[PDB]
RNA sequence: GAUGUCGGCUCAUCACAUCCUGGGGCUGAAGUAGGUCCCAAGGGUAUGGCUGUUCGCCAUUUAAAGUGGUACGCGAGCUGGGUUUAGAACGUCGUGAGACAGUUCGGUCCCUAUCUGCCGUGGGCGCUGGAGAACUGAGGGGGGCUGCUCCUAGUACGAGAGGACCGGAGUGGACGCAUCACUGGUGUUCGGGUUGUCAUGCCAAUGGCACUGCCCGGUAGCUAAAUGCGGAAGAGAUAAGUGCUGAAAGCAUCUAAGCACGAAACUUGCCCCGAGAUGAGUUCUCCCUGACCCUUUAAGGGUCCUGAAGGAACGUUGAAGACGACGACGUUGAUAGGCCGGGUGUGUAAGCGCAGCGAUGCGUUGAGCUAACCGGUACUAAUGAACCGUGAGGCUUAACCUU
RNA sequence: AAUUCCUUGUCGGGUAAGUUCCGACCUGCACGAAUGGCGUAAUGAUGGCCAGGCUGUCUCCACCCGAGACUCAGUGAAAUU
RNA sequence: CACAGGUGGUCAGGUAGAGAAUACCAAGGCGCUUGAGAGAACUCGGGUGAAGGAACUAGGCAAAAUGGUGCCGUAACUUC
RNA sequence: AGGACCGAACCGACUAAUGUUGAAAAAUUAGCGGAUGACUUGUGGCUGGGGGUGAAAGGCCAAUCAAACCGGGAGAUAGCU
RNA sequence: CCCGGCGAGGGGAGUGAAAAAGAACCUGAAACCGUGUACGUACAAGCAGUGGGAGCACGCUUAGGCGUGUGACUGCGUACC
């Protein structure tokens, strides 16, 4: 994310354990992120009769991290741990279709109400 | 129309109606006596000359007071004067402060000493700090090469290194006023502006198109 | 790094023309004091704007 | 950087910087009059005024704080009986800079450091 | 004897609550979204010392979840719906900074009277 | 008398034969996408791995994955893995000592800058009477990159699928800049906790010390991991080229004469440094109208009286900054400390009462204590002078005063 | 291979990797049975490889504190020439 | 050299601790002589660090982190 | 009992950070190792330069080592700068 | 006889032919750091020298481009072994 290498959480119903930060997307002539950004990412472990397997090379973007995320307000969201939210690198949108933690308020769109099933957040 | 001197008091990140907070810089603008003037026999240039803010007129010199006396009379700090950029005032005072930036959402702001001493090295220049591990040694900062060999013969202007800098300016440019504040004669502009919290500065508007 | 050459008696002399020893520039006439008067600034005895002030 | 601040750092790592000034406001409440450095008698001044403005009254509470604040017999027995009065009335300047002079064997800039309302003196010459 | 920093208490919005720590809040807010008739709240403990100026906030932690989450809710805009104190517990402590990144405690731990 | 090597990193920079957008010609290019292709140095021009390796192999980024150079750039830069690697051993060879443009394992890597450059900054003197004040531009760089999709636009063209540029719009990335409210960091001038021992005769409490003992909070500043933000309408000189009108060559033909048009580059505009620019500067404002003795006299030398406007030391000190210069400014004062209201911190002051075996809680007490900030408050220290600047300051043409 | 001209060997495996590491293979440089070989517990400040605590080495660097530099005072070298 | 270097014998006080680790400390020794100011680069020492966790480098690289005491619980291999 | 151990004191110095015109002719701090032994080590003793001495690097012999230093040969020779 | 510690160091007064013989004393260079005067340096720059030389002090300018010392400025120009 703001390193390479670096290993990050699963955010889907999809995988399990890690996986591993190649690059980041939506610009170049960088090494590092920022917020409300825009990752590619390799999986490194997740269990193979799941969705997700080894070493698919995919697309994702952020859904915690232990920074916490912010830009209308600047008012941050922070959480337990970095992780991000699979894409499909073909189709996009979350891969997977649960999961009981929070998503960040501060950069919401179609791709963080489509990873979660509280109704009292928006579906 | 004027550059018009504020002082650096406060600042603020501020609601719209948007659901966007915007962070701020907060401007006491104040009231403007214009001086002498010089019209365009003079230097060659049809310019306005005014005093915004002053001082307790003890350390002041009598061939600056002259001026002041001829045109509203302020005691004044110092003289500062302006080519056009909206308009001009009445010769002796127009009393402007919130008005000016109402006719421009935009401001260029003049270059002024930016309040960070030296800021230099690690701020605004290319360097690093360079790796202390593995029996690097004497090395840790400083670039170690800045040049090539006899086939320049000598050291390139386009690389520049400075253990230290004097009095440094460039300014943000044509960045947008979000608000100007009646009854309260505040000048908010957006995020970043010239100079340390506490420093004189003068803002100008729209110079460019 | 070294030299190539024995300095001559001119090099010392200008580079010294901003770099030489600077003491406190003089001081006024009294008026006031048991001492002479430090320009702007309080005596030993303290008589300066006036009493015995400083006694050190 | 040091900007839109004021006050003194010194030349003493804190452990220092504090058994320095644990000597130094003892000698100062004691004596009433001290000699030493204008950046150091600045921060000498700032240190001992708080200190007076609990200790301006002669009330025992105020007195039993003041030994909380500093376990000095010598300071907390010249305040509450014979300068607790001489501070009573006022709400701060509790202490005065007096621009001495310049240091000898040096051109460092000297002050001394006399508190507002004085009830002792030391007077021989400063070494 | 304030005359400026003044004009900051003339600009806040009136939407503020007086405070101590440890209260208990709910935070009725907007899913934001630029702005969107969609609401939601958040209750839990209030972790963090709300005194900041023209840009007060609420630093919720929601202690639900499994994970936790902290959430900062600006107060002077509109993405804050209303707000409700509660009533204030004990913390023996001004900000408890080791929520931040971790999920705990309520807002009342003890007592903290006189 | 040798300049100290590889690979990687620091740090770059210059040549354009341009990786790319941009203007333009052709196509065996229908339109579109490409190939072809001139013009053009301005700007942007990514990262991990295994190995002592370049290259290798593999994964990825961006619209994009360039060309070429630098004592095989740069060791008066970094490592020091490797090297004939000096030890050793492997692989090898000799009787051996000992050897390797074969190999592997850890292991020193020096120098305060004389002259020379690069960036920043000051002192001395001339700015033509002085002094203070505003100020113009001879000259030189920075931003100059570049995606996305809506509309433009299903339209020219085609057999059908299909099918463009600019312009208008919001918006991302780098590069450059400034900033500290927001969000993290720190905050040795601030509160509180807490392990241990030593102390205040003792208790309760408190403090010295162990890296600020350790720990967490913290005003104000600063700061990038956060923030705001340039990338420009217009002006001219063009390139290649599209031309007109038209010759060499009765015509034909950007071109040869002539004249319309013709790009981020170029001279700029926008920004920023700038009058020593002897091409010595313009323009505003202010102020000095006493005297005698002597010599080289657009003039200087001495002396009485006498030095204005202003300056400088000096003083506390800065939001300006290595130092200066720059700046607030000295009782006319918020410069710096206290102190108080506040933008604004902390966590319940020592003692005493009460319940309890007590730690401790609870009532006393939403307590007590507090730094830089913003506003106040003179509460506290910046005396009064002397001093550097003098009595109206060139020749000569043009303008004006008789002139 | 502490060894391999070619070769980053051929092939499986961990992986963004994969010269090294583990497993197998041999088109085997010049490996190869006292320059000794296979195999092994324990040990070496020993060599390589792997994953996790943790950490400013770095990504990408900020701030605080002290001693030189720099400030004020004192004394006052040198590589070289 | 007032120099942080090296050097054997005898004697053996406290608290907390597994101990001659280690904080402070009794008796005792003793301030290793620039100083003071500032808080530019930078050089060394010391404090602190978001998110990551070596990803920097031939190489994890000191400092940071690990440590102690009662009690549960405990692998391949083995010369048991 | 033990050329045993985790680990001091006591002694060393594989590696890290520094020093590298140093406080010190490798010491400091820190990872690290021996300590009932082939240790650590005082006192006293003993070998002299192509000669000693080496759990072996031609290592070490006055913080030194393919050969110390000094008096004679000696104005070695220098084909060379 | 003067300054100062009780010091370091010198002067003046007086001695002698001589103290420009003052105790390290013989007369006395050069390197070596500073003073004093003359003249030169604020539009300027390369082996630092020569060629031409404003000027200024001094020389009845020898009145005759000049003499002594210095030198704005500038032609031209690469140390010695």
Redesign the pocket.
């Known amino acids: ?8 959480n699963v955010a889907d119903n999809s995988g399990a354990r890690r996986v ?13 992120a ?2 409300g950004d825009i990752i ?1 990412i ?4 997740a269990i193979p009769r799941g969705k997700v397997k ?2 698919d ?1 995919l697309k994702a973007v952020v859904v915690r ?4 995320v ?2 209308p307000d ?3 969201i ?1 959480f337990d ?2 992780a991000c939210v699979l894409l499909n690198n073909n189709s996009e949108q979350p891969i997977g279709t649960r999961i009981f933690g929070p998503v960040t308020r501060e950069l919401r769109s179609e791709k963080f109400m489509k990873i979660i099933s509280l109704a009292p957040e928006v579906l | 129309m004027i550059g018009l001197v504020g002082k ?2 406060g ?3 501020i609601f719209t109606e948007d659901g966007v907070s ?4 907060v401007i006491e603008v104040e009231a403007n006596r214009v001086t ?1 003037v ?1 019209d365009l026999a ?4 049809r ?1 306005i ?1 005014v005093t915004t803010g002053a ?2 007129a ?2 002041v ?7 002041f ?2 045109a509203g009379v302020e005691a004044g ?7 056009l950029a909206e308009g001009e005032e009445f010769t002796v005072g127009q009393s402007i402060s919130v008005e000016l930036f109402a006719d421009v959402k935009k401001v ?1 702001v ?2 002024t ?12 220049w ?27 013969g ?23 006023v979000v608000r100007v504040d009646a009854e309260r004669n505040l000048l908010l502009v ?11 500065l003068i803002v100008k508007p729209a ?3 | ?7 001559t ?1 001119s090099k ?2 200008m580079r010294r023309s ?1 770099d030489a ?6 001081l ?5 004091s048991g001492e002479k ?1 430090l ?4 005596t030993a005895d303290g008589y ?2 006036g009493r015995k002030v400083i006694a050190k | ?19 320095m000034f ?1 000597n130094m406001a003892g000698s100062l409440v004691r004596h009433e009059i001290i000699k030493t ?4 008698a ?1 921060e000498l ?3 001992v ?3 007076i ?2 200790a301006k009254t002669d009330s025992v ?2 007195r ?2 003041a ?5 000095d ?1 010598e300071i907390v027995a010249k305040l509450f009986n014979e300068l607790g009065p001489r501070f009573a009335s ?5 202490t ?4 001495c002079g ?1 240091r000898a ?5 000297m002050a001394y450091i006399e508190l ?1 309302d004085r009830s002792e003196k030391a007077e021989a010459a400063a070494e | ?6 004009l ?2 003339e600009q806040m919005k009136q939407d503020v609550p007086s405070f ?2 440890g209260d208990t809040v709910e935070v009725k807010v907007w899913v934001v979204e630029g702005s969107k008739k969609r609401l939601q709240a958040f209750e839990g403990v209030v972790i963090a ?1 709300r ?3 023209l ?3 609420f630093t919720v932690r929601k202690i639900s979840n499994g994970e936790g989450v902290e959430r ?1 809710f600006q107060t002077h805009s509109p993405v804050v719906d209303s707000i409700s104190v509660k009533r ?1 517990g ?6 408890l ?1 080791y929520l ?2 971790r999920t705990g405690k309520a807002a009342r731990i003890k ?4």
């Open positions: 994310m703001i390193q390479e290498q670096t290993m990050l591993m930060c190649i690059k980041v997307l939506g610009g170049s002539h960088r090494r590092y920022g917020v590619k390799t999986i490194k472990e080894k070493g090379v991290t232990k920074k916490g912010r830009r600047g008012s941050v922070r741990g970095n | 650096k008091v600042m603020t990140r915007i962070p701020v810089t002498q010089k003079n230097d060659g240039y310019a000359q001082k307790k003890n350390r010199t009598k061939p600056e007071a002259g001026h006396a001829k700090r110092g003289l500062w004067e302006f080519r260029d003049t270059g000493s930016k309040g960070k001493g030296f800021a230099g090295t690690v701020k605004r290319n360097f690093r700090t360079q790796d202390a591990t593995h029996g690097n040694s004497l090395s840790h900062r400083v670039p170690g090469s800045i040049g090539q060999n006899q086939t320049p000598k050291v390139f202007k386009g690389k520049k290194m400075a253990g230290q800098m004097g009095n440094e300016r460039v300014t943000v440019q044509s960045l947008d957006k995020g970043a502006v010239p100079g340390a919290t506490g420093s004189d110079v460019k198109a | 790094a070294v030299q190539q050459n024995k300095p008696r010392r002399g901003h020893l600077t003491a406190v520039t003089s006024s006439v009294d008026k006031t008067h320009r702007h600034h309080i300066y704007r | 950087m040091r900007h839109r601040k004021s006050g003194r750092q010194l030349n003493r790592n804190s452990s220092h910087r504090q058994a644990r450095t204008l950046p150091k600045k001044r700032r240190v005024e708080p200190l403005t609990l509470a105020n039993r704080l030994f909380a604040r500093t376990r017999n006022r709400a701060g300047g509790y005065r800079i007096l621009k310049f064997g040096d051109n460092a800039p507002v | 004897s304030n005359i400026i920093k003044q900051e208490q101590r720590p010392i005194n900041r100026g840009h007060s906030a900062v204030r004990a913390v023996r402590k001004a900000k900074y931040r990144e007592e903290r009277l006189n």
